[PDB]
Design a protein around this ligand. Structure first.
Ligand code: BO2
Ligand code: BO2
Ligand code: BO2
Ligand code: BO2
Ligand code: CL
Ligand code: CL
Ligand code: MG
Ligand code: MG
Ligand code: MG
Ligand code: MG
Lengths: 233, 195, 212, 196, 204, 222, 226, 195, 196
């Protein structure tokens, strides 16, 4: 049993017709102090998987090292390491899910919420969640922390059920994700303007976008707001 | 205090109440009468926290005696029981509530019927053929459920009461030093001196 | 829960209720609170559900192994002590058990052992265990004799559970009867309390307090 | 919360962020923490929103009644009325208030009233959760008798840093200028102050 | 410890075609110990019926209180109080004890004598009004009652059909609750006749 | 302090017919006041004509189902591909649960299938391993809403025959698979109305001698 | 609970869902959360239901007497001030979280109120357990100079976000529009996207199914003449 | 369990031990023998937490019986008491200590003297003319202090023991359902079947 | 505690105060918080004195053994050994360490290791109770590729403010310069840095 010290906030994601999108801001908070401003919380595994992590950063860095070691180990005595016997999103997830549940069962959890986004060998979209308790679930849209409360409602308006996935293009999906990140910046007190975004497509592969910023923000209406009720000046 | 029982038969109400008073480690007394006569045809037994029991019982007694003198008339058991309930229902939301449970056995001279009322410290009133407070009911109710019939005589009621006390003396951990038994009927209140 | 067992002329009567509760919620009315350890041995169930199930089935495995090894029926004393010694190892860990181990052998005759999750192991003639034990004791103590017929002994057990089922909120559902002789136990049916109450009330003249 | 008041040559300027939080949720991103208790006596509010509003409403009432009887009250007087409420009700209040005002006789004045209910007259004052991160900056960069433009830059840069590091601070930077000329409201948006 | 589940009990109400029904169990207990099988929880002031679950002392106290208030109402107004008006009186009376409340779950049922419209309403322990079209539930087996009513109920039932529905809703809910049962009563209410039926149920 | 348990909501329902058995469960997964997934399968085909669901804390639920599926696999390896009977599966599950008696799988488990005589069977488990064969059982969040309805409409409790007035009970006539599915759908529709953790979708698994069939129905998404 | 308020060109609109809950159980499926303080001042309430009702009635009553005393139509700031001071006095124990809106001779107004007595001003606001789902929609689609039709659409969409995504909210959408120089229109059940489907079976019982012990006529009439 | 007494007279040791076993609310048994014979001339009575008492007593019994067989010799009461003390003194610092108090009455055949040892669950041993555990001593020691004389006969010892039990039955709140009395002397151990 | 490490053109400089406190009592006013784990790999210590000493001693041992087998270790390697101890023993440790070192290949590097045991490579790092008061100042005044004299002034001014505001910081300002030229120790007394 511990307490999280340096923490990362929301990770958000969704499926679209040819793949999956995932995103997370670049902040490492120390309580209310916005301590570290250059923290990458999306970690790619090969060219077909991106693992997005929230919660304790020291535990994130440990998981990052486990995944790095997983790639090394898979290559050992494996002539098809870059082909048929490459690491799948489903393999990477199940491994993490096993570790997370084992650690909670020893009363010494990895204090995180994780989303594994990727595309499988047969082109199928993979998107599944796991957290410190070992709880797992899948959905057309997935989000952690504040994203669960604010991002999902917006993303579910695009893809409300399974049959909405083929009808959703990559442009429409990315637009929705970027909008959700703006909303989170308006409303989450432990978020930052800077974020990373990753697209995993069955045709165009893995596109990893760094140093993105929230833009087109509405603040002008603030000038008209005066006092808390009766004040006019 | 500990065990208080009540049973209503054809033409009377019978109340049985333990004699023991225990202050923690020792039994200070083995002849204590846990009852007060409220009016000539109404008797109240009681059990609860020390001090509060007698204080409450005597306070009720004084109030009913005052009513009797003012109106030159005896209140019905139903009326007395309602007064007692209200006092306890008032008490439960006070600064320091009366921690007292009571049984009210009375003979209504107007209707020519015996009546038994069970009231707990919260002010929860029920009219019953037979009743008890505390753990007494846990041992005795199964016997009363089997044997009570509503046309019993007073002698049959005492025999069924003896069977209850015998079960209590067999299965209860505490020695309650026997019971004082009192009968309430058309002629008033009397004590059974050999039980 | 109300479970009882008593020794008499004809052997042992065992009677239990059927109710299981989670708080005020009635989880089940069809619980088998008597465990058939073998054709000759019965165990009653009271307290926490699984503990008594799990360890009394386990007890049956130990008894079977004993008589495989020793070529002889296990004594009630030995069978009860295997269970009591086992739970004593777990004392403190939080097991919740109150049971009667009942049997009939040549060397012992009809025997009942009260076994307990605090480690208690008591031999005796009459035992009632559970939240409604006090209600059942009343009927037993006043009507119990050694010279009871198997028919009358069965009824007394049935009636004592009914008494508790009526008053105790955490007892009820139905009554399971068993009669234990030297040649083994004999099941005497499931009796719904809903039907048994009205039947007994009418025929026995009891429960005049209740309207029917 | 990041709030501050700074005296300068022509008077005094109050400055504040616009973020109100319920834990990590920003309940209001465009809050007005600069509030008016008299024509040229304003205050900055930190701590409980309910408490500081209740206090500010009572003070405005007291000063309105003072004005009707004895004419315009001093800034010191306003600070004393704030203190009296904060001190006497210290057990039930969570309020950190900065009082700033402009007289013609006394010119610009700043009084800070922390949790206890004590009063401290200062050349400039900082308060709120975000103030911790700018003690170093403000101490190094404050000068007495600055110009209006210099003081606006000092507050803008200071609160910019406080917002950058404190999660409980954010949104727009509101300011209120108090001089002989009158009362001027200023607003500065994220795109402006983040690139500083 | 929890005041609302020391004594136990339930009440349910339903609307039908030109009629309403209200029903309750008869149990009063001291936790596990069953004390009384004749503790009726439905009372009536004129043509307005009130069921009350929860702590029994408060059930009794409130009945006496509303009898008190509806009697004064009638003397001054020169007419019987209507269900809609009584509902507001219950709410007012409960809320005045906001920070020292009666631990109860009241249920109002009746037909407006002028409009002929069937009316039911429920409350929490502190006055909030739940005015449902279909049904109201209250007591220690309210979850069970919600499940029964939600499936068994259909609108515009005739009085004799409505009786069967509400009776089966109560009985089967009570049998899944340790602190409810020991008898039951059902009131069928029409504009100018009210029938009261005691139900035969298991006594454990 | 770290709390190793959580509550993922959901509700499940098992009913045993004369020559069939159904195990149903809603597809909604939640924490607190948020929806995690509107379609997260909860009832699983475990092989050997056995269906299983472990409702409550989903992490423990998944772990248990995973270990039982594993147990079926090794039962085949160790005992010459013998079919694991429903009664044997039940006893095995008790030992899986009791193995963690002092750090329990926080779930309400239900399995369904056919017994060795071909008759419908349902078994029910508490978190620490106590089990019992049953004709009817609901588990999870809205179990208290559903069970009383099933006592009335499956076992005809408190129902009697008209004209006799309480003397003659309603006879316990057998229900078809079409009749059971109707009662399952109405049970979940009703539960969805009054329980916030129930909704989105209903997935039913039907077990007969022919095998395991699936049916899906929409539920209210609010 | 999801409640919102949205300013527009010539007035203000408020909306709310219709679900009330005791723990995980739904107590009422069609609850009314839009309260009338005065003819053209309405507020929506979240939190403890008895409190939002009671505090609205009390202030609404005093507002009516104040309006009669002054011979003036009531103002939103008066309702705001009276509500906040009442709630502050009770130190948060009266659990009323309100969105107060209305039109008066000063103009159109929109405020929020929390239980401890703090107030906030805004063009768009949301309160309750589904406020985050609603606020997400508001932050995505709100603009300056909304029309009446656009504001109603935005308000109901924000409630829908709460209905679908928040377990504390559900059922229907209630709306109330308050436009300047017009009567306030209260649109009860403006949307109904949660009608229950037909049941598979009818559960109407055969008459005589239930066992009865006794029957009797209840005397509801008064003591009779003659 | 509850009351255990012991008295050493001229030529014997007498142990008295209550018969009641109570499981919270009910008295499950009224004929329980709270004693074990460790050897032909050594008897141990016991009282403490449920289960632990019998488990400990039988464990000691087995060990002494093992010693007797191995050496073909009976250990002295002093030796047995020291063994028992050490087991309890070991127990008190264990993971889960034996919650058991004991009296050891024995007749030493070498010295031709009766011996009574009182040992509590901590392993606190004292040799005494008369002893008790729990609240038993609070009532009885004043009578024993007055009447005890060490040249008492066994019949005089039983009479003084009756006086102790009578005081316990008068002033103790709990009904312990009488006592089983056993005598240890040169001829061994026997039970007084009428007491 | 006020500690910081800053990279610059020629390498890296570590800086620290000298105050050790037991509550409000200054147990040592001349403490050396800049400690050597290798010739040109040093660290700044904050948190528990016992824990950070125990850790630093173990790290020095590990790097001494590394050197004997594999030659001079990198700064990254040293940071990893610190992390491994801090992360794996997070439940029992209270240690906030900044690791700074000079390679010829990598030049000056700074790694900060906060409570959790995470690692963060940065151009400069601040830590300790007193660092809170200089986030604003340091962010505004740090530039990359500063000179030695500029970096000494930056650290001197920064820690001066941290000392001024933090009661847990005080005494002398110690510094350690790490370049190709070697290792230089600097000290600055109160009379010097207080008048800044
Ligand atoms: B009986 O009432 O003791 C009964 C016996 C058991 C073998 C079925 N116990 C229970 O029903 C207990 C509750 C209880 C009531 C009264 C005394 C002791 C215990 N039930 C449970 O422990 C339980 C736990 N989880 C789910 C359902 N029931
Ligand atoms: B500021 O962060 O101190 C701010 C000033 C306030 C006057 C608007 N306070 C708040 O945001 C407080 C919480 C708080 C944060 C940090 C320190 C102290 C207090 N918020 C509220 O009082 C609040 C939050 N949600 C609703 C209503 N009020
Ligand atoms: B919403 O979720 O804020 C909603 C708004 C209310 C005005 C209808 N709140 C409720 O429904 C509250 C939730 C609650 C539960 C428990 C304590 C406090 C608040 N419910 C009730 O007030 C309620 C519950 N049951 C009956 C009556 N009222
Ligand atoms: B500094 O203030 O963090 C300092 C650094 C330490 C390595 C010399 N720590 C201390 O002075 C600590 C107390 C402390 C103060 C502030 C934050 C965390 C810890 N002091 C001690 O560990 C100490 C005190 N007295 C004797 C021995 N050790
Ligand atoms: Cl504010
Ligand atoms: Cl040191
Ligand atoms: Mg019962
Ligand atoms: Mg919803
Ligand atoms: Mg001793
Ligand atoms: Mg200092």
């Amino acid at each position: 049993t511990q307490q999280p010290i340096v923490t990362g906030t929301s990770v958000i994601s969704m499926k679209y017709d040819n793949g999956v999108i995932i995103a997370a801001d670049n902040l490492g908070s120390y309580g209310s102090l916005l301590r570290f401003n250059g923290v990458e919380r999306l970690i790619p595994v090969g060219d077909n998987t991106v693992v997005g992590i929230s919660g304790d950063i020291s535990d994130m860095q440990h998981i990052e090292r486990l995944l790095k070691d997983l790639v090394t180990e898979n290559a050992y005595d494996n002539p098809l390491a870059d082909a048929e016997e490459a690491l799948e999103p489903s393999y990477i997830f199940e491994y993490l899910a096993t570790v997370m549940y084992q650690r909670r069962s020893k009363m010494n959890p990895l204090w995180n919420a994780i989303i594994v986004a990727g595309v499988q060998s047969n082109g199928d979209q993979f998107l599944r969640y796991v957290n410190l308790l070992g709880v797992t679930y899948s959905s057309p849209t997935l989000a952690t922390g504040f994203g669960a409360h604010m991002a999902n409602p917006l993303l579910r308006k695009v893809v409300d059920r399974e049959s909405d996935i083929p009808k959703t293009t990559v442009q429409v999906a990315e637009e929705a994700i970027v909008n959700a990140m703006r909303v989170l910046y308006y409303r989450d007190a432990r978020s930052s303007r800077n974020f990373s975004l990753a697209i995993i497509d069955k045709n165009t592969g893995l596109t990893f976008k760094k140093n993105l910023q929230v833009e087109n923000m509405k603040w002008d209406f603030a000038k008209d707001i005066k006092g808390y009720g009766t004040q006019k000046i | 205090m500990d065990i208080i029982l009540g049973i209503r038969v054809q033409d009377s109400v019978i109340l049985a109440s333990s004699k023991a008073v225990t202050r923690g480690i020792s039994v200070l007394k083995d002849s204590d009468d846990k009852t007060r006569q409220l009016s000539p045809h109404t008797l109240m037994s009681f059990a609860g926290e020390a001090g509060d029991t007698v204080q409450f019982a005597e306070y009720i007694q004084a109030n009913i005696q005052l009513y009797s003198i003012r109106e030159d008339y005896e209140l019905s058991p139903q009326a007395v029981s309602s007064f007692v309930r209200q006092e306890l229902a008032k008490s439960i939301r006070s600064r320091r509530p009366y921690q007292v449970n009571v049984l009210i056995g009375g003979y209504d001279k107007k209707k020519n019927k015996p009546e038994l009322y069970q009231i707990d410290y919260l002010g929860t009133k029920v009219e019953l053929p037979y009743g008890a407070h505390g753990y007494s009911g846990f041992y005795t109710f199964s016997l009363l459920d089997h044997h009570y019939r509503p046309d019993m005589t007073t002698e049959e009621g005492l025999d069924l009461l003896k069977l209850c006390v015998q079960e209590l003396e067999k299965r209860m951990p505490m020695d309650f030093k026997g019971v004082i038994v009192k009968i309430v009927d058309k002629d008033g209140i009397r004590q059974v001196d050999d039980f | 829960t109300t479970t009882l067992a008593f020794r008499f002329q004809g052997g042992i009567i065992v009677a239990v209720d059927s109710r299981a509760t989670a708080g005020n919620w009635v989880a089940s009315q069809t619980v088998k609170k008597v465990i058939e350890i073998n054709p000759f041995l019965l165990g009653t169930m009271a307290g926490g559900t699984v503990d008594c199930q799990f360890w009394e089935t386990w007890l049956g495995s130990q008894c079977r192994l004993h008589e495989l090894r020793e070529k002889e029926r296990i004594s009630v004393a030995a069978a009860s002590k295997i269970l009591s010694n086992l739970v004593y190892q777990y004392k403190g860990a939080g097991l919740s058990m109150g049971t009667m181990i009942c049997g009939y052998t040549r060397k012992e005759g009809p025997t009942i052992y009260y076994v307990d999750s605090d480690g208690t192991r008591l031999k005796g003639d009459i035992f009632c265990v559970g939240s409604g034990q006090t209600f059942a004791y009343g009927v037993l103590d006043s009507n119990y004799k050694w010279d009871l017929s198997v028919e009358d002994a069965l009824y007394l057990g049935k009636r004592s559970i009914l008494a508790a089922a009526h008053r105790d909120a955490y007892s009820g559902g139905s009554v399971n009867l068993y009669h234990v002789t030297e040649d083994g136990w004999i099941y005497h049916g499931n009796h719904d309390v809903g039907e048994l109450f009205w039947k007994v009330k009418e025929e026995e003249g009891s429960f005049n307090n209740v309207i029917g | 919360t990041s709030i501050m008041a700074v005296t300068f040559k022509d008077g005094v300027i109050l400055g504040a962020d616009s973020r109100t939080t319920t834990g990590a949720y920003i309940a209001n991103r465009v809050t007005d923490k600069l509030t008016r208790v008299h024509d040229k006596i304003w205050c900055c509010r930190s701590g409980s929103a309910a408490d500081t509003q209740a206090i500010a409403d009572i003070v405005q009432y007291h000063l309105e009644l003072y004005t009707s009887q004895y004419g315009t009250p001093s800034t010191e007087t306003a600070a004393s009325v704030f203190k009296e409420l904060c001190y006497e009700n210290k057990d039930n209040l969570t309020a950190g208030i900065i009082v700033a005002g402009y007289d013609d006789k006394n010119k610009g004045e700043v009084y800070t009233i922390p949790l206890g209910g004590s009063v401290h007259k200062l050349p400039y004052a900082i308060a709120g959760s975000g103030s911790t991160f700018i003690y170093g900056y403000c101490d190094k960069n404050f000068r007495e008798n600055m110009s209006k433009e210099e003081t606006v830059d000092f507050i803008k840069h200071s609160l910019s840093q406080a917002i950058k590091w404190d999660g409980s601070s954010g949104g727009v930077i509101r300011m209120v200028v108090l001089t002989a000329a009158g009362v001027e409201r200023l607003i500065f948006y994220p795109d402006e102050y983040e690139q500083l | 410890s929890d005041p609302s589940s020391i004594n136990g009990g339930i009440v349910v109400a339903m609307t039908g075609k030109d009629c309403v029904a209200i029903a309750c169990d008869l149990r009063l207990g001291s936790q596990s110990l069953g004390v009384s099988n004749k503790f009726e929880k439905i009372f009536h002031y004129g043509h307005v019926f009130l069921g009350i679950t929860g702590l029994a002392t408060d059930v009794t106290t409130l009945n006496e209180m509303f009898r008190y208030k509806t009697n004064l109402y009638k003397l001054k107004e020169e007419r019987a109080i209507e269900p809609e008006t009584f509902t507001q009186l219950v709410s007012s009376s409960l809320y005045e004890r906001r920070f020292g409340p009666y631990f109860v779950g009241p249920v109002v049922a009746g037909i407006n004598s002028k409009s002929g419209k069937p009316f039911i309403a429920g409350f929490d322990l502190i006055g909030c009004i739940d005015e449902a079209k279909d049904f109201i539930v209250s007591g220690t087996a309210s979850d069970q009652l919600f499940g029964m009513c939600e499936s068994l109920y259909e609108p515009n039932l005739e009085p004799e059909d409505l009786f069967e529905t509400i009776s089966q809703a109560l009985l089967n809910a009570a049998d899944r609750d340790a602190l409810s049962g020991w008898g039951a009563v059902v009131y069928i209410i029409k504009k100018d006749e009210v029938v009261k039926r005691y139900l035969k149920m298991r006594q454990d | 302090q770290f709390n190793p348990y959580g509550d993922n909501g959901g509700t499940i329902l098992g009913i045993a017919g004369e020559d069939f058995a159904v195990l149903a469960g809603d597809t909604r997964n939640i924490t607190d006041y948020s929806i995690n997934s509107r379609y997260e399968p909860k009832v699983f085909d475990c092989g050997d004509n056995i269906v299983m669901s472990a409702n409550g804390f989903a992490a423990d639920g998944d772990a248990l189902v995973k270990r039982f599926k594993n147990s079926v696999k090794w039962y085949h390896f160790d005992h010459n591909d013998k079919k694991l009977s429903i009664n044997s599966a039940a006893r095995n599950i008790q030992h899986l649960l009791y193995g963690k008696r002092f750090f329990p799988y926080y779930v309400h488990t239900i399995i369904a299938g056919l017994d060795e005589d071909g008759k419908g069977a349902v078994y029910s488990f508490d978190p620490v391993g106590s089990y019992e064969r049953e004709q009817c059982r609901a588990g999870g969040a809205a179990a208290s809403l559903i069970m009383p309805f099933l006592d009335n409409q499956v076992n005809f409790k408190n129902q009697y025959e008209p004209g006799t007035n309480g003397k003659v009970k309603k006879p316990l006539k057998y229900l078809s698979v079409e009749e059971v599915i109707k009662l399952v759908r109405d049970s979940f529709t009703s539960a969805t109305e009054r329980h916030i953790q129930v909704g989105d979708g209903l997935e039913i698994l039907i077990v007969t001698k022919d095998g395991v069939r699936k049916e899906f129905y929409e539920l209210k998404r609010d | 609970t999801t409640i919102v308020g949205v300013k527009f060109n010539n007035g203000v609109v408020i909306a709310a869902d219709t679900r009330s809950t005791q723990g995980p159980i739904v107590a009422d499926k069609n609850c009314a959360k839009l309260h009338r303080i005065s003819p053209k001042i309405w507020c929506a309430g979240a939190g403890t239901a008895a409190d939002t009702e009671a505090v609205t009635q009390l202030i609404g009553s005093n507002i009516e007497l104040h309006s009669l005393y002054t011979s003036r139509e009531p103002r939103v700031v008066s309702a705001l001030q009276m509500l906040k001071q009442h709630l502050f006095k009770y130190q948060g124990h009266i659990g009323a979280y309100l969105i107060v809106a209305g039109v008066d001779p000063t103009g159109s107004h929109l405020f929020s109120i929390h239980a401890h007595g703090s107030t906030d001003v805004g063009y768009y606001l949301s309160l309750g357990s589904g406020s985050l789902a609603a606020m997400a929609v508001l932050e995505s689609h709100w603009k300056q100079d909304l029309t009446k039709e656009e504001a109603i659409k935005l308000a109901s969409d924000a409630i829908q976000a709460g209905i679908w995504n928040d377990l504390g909210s559900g059922s229907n959408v209630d709306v109330c529009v308050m436009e300047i120089g017009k009567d306030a229109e209260y649109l009860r059940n403006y949307l109904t996207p949660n009608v229950r489907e037909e049941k598979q079976k009818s559960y109407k019982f055969p008459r005589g199914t239930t066992a009865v012990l006794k029957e009797s006529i209840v005397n509801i009439c008064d003591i009779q003449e003659e």
